[PDB]
Amino acid sequence: SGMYRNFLKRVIDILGALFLLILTSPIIIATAIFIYFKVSRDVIFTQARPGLNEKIFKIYKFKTMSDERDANGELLPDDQRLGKFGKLIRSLSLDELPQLFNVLKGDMSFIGPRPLLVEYLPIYNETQKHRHDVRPGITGLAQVNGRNAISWEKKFEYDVYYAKNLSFMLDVKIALQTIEKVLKR
């Protein structure tokens, strides 16, 4: 290919992220306000993950757990630092919204491999390393093919096949498989 792989896919990523950022902007400001006054005035925390050509970038996400400490300082267990409304924000995936800015700025695509830990970079073999030949995605070929089994090698098989055979057909197929995925629980 080339015409869609090297150009048109990025435009849909930019416009889509820009449209969705303006579309959910009241919810974004509302979420940040609640977190500011009841969780943490830092609101946003970043996540360093490998991306295109394995280059590290920070993933933006809303902070949901408090920054509470202990009499000795070792933080409370995760049970007591995550209130009911924090779980509600997590449940509605509102904390995930800042990643639209990641998609907009080029860190990620709308459809692509899942951003995983930096630890796995030396573990990937010569075939699985190719999953970083494309930008990571909010959804992708591996996310829609979940079969209640943790076969990392088969997830990586889907990842490598996607990076090699990126098509406008395939992207539409993933998009339909993603909305049909959410029609179920």
Numbering used by the authors: -1 to 183
Authors' description from the paper:
pmcPhosphoglycosyl transferases (PGTs) catalyze the transfer of a phosphosugar group from a UDP-sugar substrate to a membrane-resident polyprenol phosphate (most commonly in bacteria undecaprenol or decaprenol phosphate) acceptor. PglC is a monotopic phosphoglycosyl transferase that embodies the functional core structure of the entire enzyme superfamily and catalyzes the first membrane-committed step in a glycoprotein assembly pathway.
In the current study, further insight is derived from the structure of selenomethionine (SeMet)-derivatized PglC co-crystallized with UDP. UDP was utilized in co-crystallization, as it significantly stabilized this PGT as shown by nanoscale differential scanning fluorimetry (nanoDSF). Although the resolution was low (3.01 Å), and the ligand was not stoichiometrically bound (10–20% occupancy of any ligand to the active site), it was possible to make correlations between the presence or absence of electron density and the loop conformations. When the eight copies of PglC in the ASU were overlaid, the mobile loop is the main region of structural divergence between the chains. In monomers G and H, which are closed, as well as A and B (intermediate conformation), a comparatively large number of electrons is present in the site where the nucleotide would be expected to bind. In contrast, monomers C, D, E, and F, which are open, all have significantly fewer electrons present. Analysis of the mobile loop in the context of active-site ligand occupancy shows that chains with a greater positive electron density were in a more closed conformation than those with little or no density. Monomers occupying the same position within each of the four lattice dimers do not always occupy the same mobile loop position; thus, the difference in the observed loop conformation is likely due to differential binding at the active site.
